Amino acid sequence: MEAIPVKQFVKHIGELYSNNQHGFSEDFEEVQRCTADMNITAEHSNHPENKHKNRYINILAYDHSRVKLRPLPSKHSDYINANYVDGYNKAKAYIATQGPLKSTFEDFWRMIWEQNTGIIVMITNLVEKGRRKCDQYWPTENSEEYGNIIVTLKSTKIHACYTVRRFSIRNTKVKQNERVVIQYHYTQWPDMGVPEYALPVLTFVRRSSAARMPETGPVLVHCSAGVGRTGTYIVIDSMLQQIKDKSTVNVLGFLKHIRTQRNYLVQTEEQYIFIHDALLEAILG
């Protein structure tokens, strides 16, 4: 189970799809079992003092890979539900994290400053099908203050399927010192069912990924829980890098791997199939 030449990957997709996606089903179940003989601790996520900091009681941040906040003059001011995740070759190329709650906007922006993140990839809407997915952690307009980071919205471009917001943030307890942070926000979400046509996404991935500057902190990627759509993004992004580099693909292997770094990355078979549709589009296009 290693890399597949890009020229036979497309053929492979045919096989995975046939007989009602039986092959896709076997792959993803392998992925879900891939953790089986594996205990990964998330004690910090389960600590009573950190509970109100998790959006979902079941969606945790593995200890070994968790992003640590600089502790504050309490014992658990270091905790945020987030994990470093690997990209193509490069270790810790992403921070995959949940959609921020009101009570964690400070942690969220502190992490971004502390990690020197320059790009945010947002893969949810605040509200979807009437349900709360994510609290708005940025200024509707002008500036807003979170802890010692105050964020200023500088410009916005709204496309068919996503929006790009350029922020300038300054730390007040520095010097102040300022950074640009660019948010890529995918906004095109189904009233009924789930996303299906992968081409607009491929474009989103291509443009947000190309926005990464040398040599900066990891790209922050979040949806709501920070595992499903977030994992889909990371795999599509990484595999496109691999294709450019070596003209080979390894979805099943890379995914089993990043699954050790954050629980449930790529959460459903449908998302798993979607990754393949995205990459098929890139290859044929």
Ligand X SMILES: Nc1cccc(S(=O)(=O)NC(=O)c2sccc2SCc2ccc(Cl)c(Cl)c2)c1
Q: Does 186 bind ligand X (CB under 6 A)?
A: yes
Position among 209, 232, 260, 261 found at the interface with ligand X (CB under 6 A): 232
**Reading across the β-sheet that carries 162-171, which strands appear in turn?**
66-68, 79-85, 94-97, 219-222, 119-122, 177-186, 162-171, 149-158, 143-146
Rounded-to-integer distance, Cα 180 and Cα 21, Å: 44
Q: Does 195 bind ligand X (CB under 6 A)?
A: yes
Could you give the residue ranges of the DSSP H alpha helices within the chain? 6-33, 43-46, 105-114, 199-210, 228-246, 251-258, 269-284
Position among 99, 100, 118, 228 found at the interface with ligand X (CB under 6 A): 228
Rounded-to-integer distance, Cα 244 and Cα 228, Å: 25
Q: Does 270 bind ligand X (CB under 6 A)?
A: yes
Q: Does 268 bind ligand X (CB under 6 A)?
A: yes
Position among 111, 123, 220, 258 found at the interface with ligand X (CB under 6 A): 123
Angle at 15 between CA 10 and CA 21, to 5 degrees: 115
Position among 267, 276, 279, 282 found at the interface with ligand X (CB under 6 A): 267
Which range, of 43-51, 96-104, 140-148, 230-238, touches ligand X by CB under 6 A?
Answer: 230-238
The answer to whether residue 134 is catalytic is no
Rounded-to-integer distance, Cα 181 and Cα 167, Å: 5
Residue whose C-beta lies closest to ligand X: 228
> Longest Cα pair distance anywhere in the chain, in angstroms?
63
Q: Give the total of residues touching ligand X (CB under 6 A).
A: 17
Position among 183, 260, 263, 271 found at the interface with ligand X (CB under 6 A): 271
Binding site residues, ligand X, CB under 6 A: 123, 186, 194-195, 201, 204-205, 228-229, 232-233, 236, 267-268, 270-271, 274
Q: Indicate which residues carry an active-site annotation.
A: 223
